Ligand binder design. Structure first.
Ligand SMILES: CC#C[C@]1(O)CC[C@H]2[C@@H]3CCC4=CC(=O)CCC4=C3[C@@H](c3ccc(N(C)C)cc3)C[C@@]21C
Length: 250
């Protein structure tokens, strides 16, 4: 049977979130980017709500909670994007939302095709590894807990304990299907290596995002309130490498 913490994690998953995109008009660079920003805002609010229900998180200092959300939102959103694409469209479209689905042809006409291909890697890897929902749910918590300040957190002890607890839960999630010590240990390496590899992909997304933000007036792209502050609050520092990415492997 499924371990209770994994069961809890499934129960607190956000519901389906819509972009509010107007699909009756043809795509433009500005319209797509704006819908993506609107969806991002909605997904951020959803991440905040999720975090409030996430066992352990509310007991970290409030400053730490804010920092970890500010550090991890891009990772959580692209990982989510990968999951939805894998589950709803067999990994073969980018499933941003039910009203914002980009098949490859739409990607090619997006104006940011290379960015789409970079993002599209994640669901193709989920297809390759056949990631289970239980593994996904645990890995997603670890992404929230995958970067800390250079000086550490205020609730560092509690953070280490919480992070270690979700790593132990990932190991149980793996043990649900992959039986055999060799397979299970290899599976842990592969899934944790995937999380390590996400740091680099996410850096490309952070740069694109920051450039788009700076040039938002010229490009006629709107950035909502919570998006503007999470970017204001940490993106340059993160891009500069003035934080500590946590790696599972050297
Ligand atoms: C085209 C394009 C583009 C981007 O600027 C770069 C990565 C995109 C990100 C991917 C991963 C991603 C997955 C989603 O499901 C929603 C949106 C999303 C984005 C976009 C985004 C926009 C604003 C925010 N805020 C308000 C915090 C969050 C995410 C658009 C992003 C950043």
């Amino acid at each position: 049977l499924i371990p209770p913490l994994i069961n809890l994690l499934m129960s607190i998953e956000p519901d389906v979130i819509y972009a509010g995109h107007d699909n009756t008009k043809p795509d433009t660079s500005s319209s797509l980017l704006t819908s993506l920003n609107q969806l991002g805002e909605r997904q951020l609010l959803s991440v905040v709500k999720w975090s409030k229900s996430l066992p352990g998180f509310r007991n970290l200092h409030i400053d730490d909670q804010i920092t970890l959300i500010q550090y991890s939102w891009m990772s959580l959103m692209v990982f989510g994007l990968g999951w939805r694409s894998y589950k709803h469209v067999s990994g073969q479209m980018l499933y941003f939302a039910p009203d914002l689905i980009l098949n490859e042809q739409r990607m090619k006409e997006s104006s940011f095709y290379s960015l789409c291909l970079t993002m599209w890697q994640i669901p193709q890897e989920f297809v390759k590894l056949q990631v289970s929902q239980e593994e996904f749910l645990c890995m997603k918590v670890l992404l929230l807990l995958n970067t800390i300040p250079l000086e550490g957190l205020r609730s560092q002890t509690q953070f280490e304990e919480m992070r270690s607890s979700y790593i132990r839960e990932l190991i149980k999630a793996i043990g649900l299907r992959q039986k055999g010590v060799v397979s299970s240990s290899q599976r842990f390496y592969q899934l944790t290596k995937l999380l390590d590899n996400l740091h680099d992909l996410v850096k490309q997304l952070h740069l694109y995002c920051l450039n788009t933000f700076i040039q938002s007036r010229a490009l006629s792209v709107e950035f909502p309130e919570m998006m503007s502050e999470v970017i204001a609050a940490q993106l340059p520092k993160i891009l500069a490498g003035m934080v500590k990415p946590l790696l599972f492997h050297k």
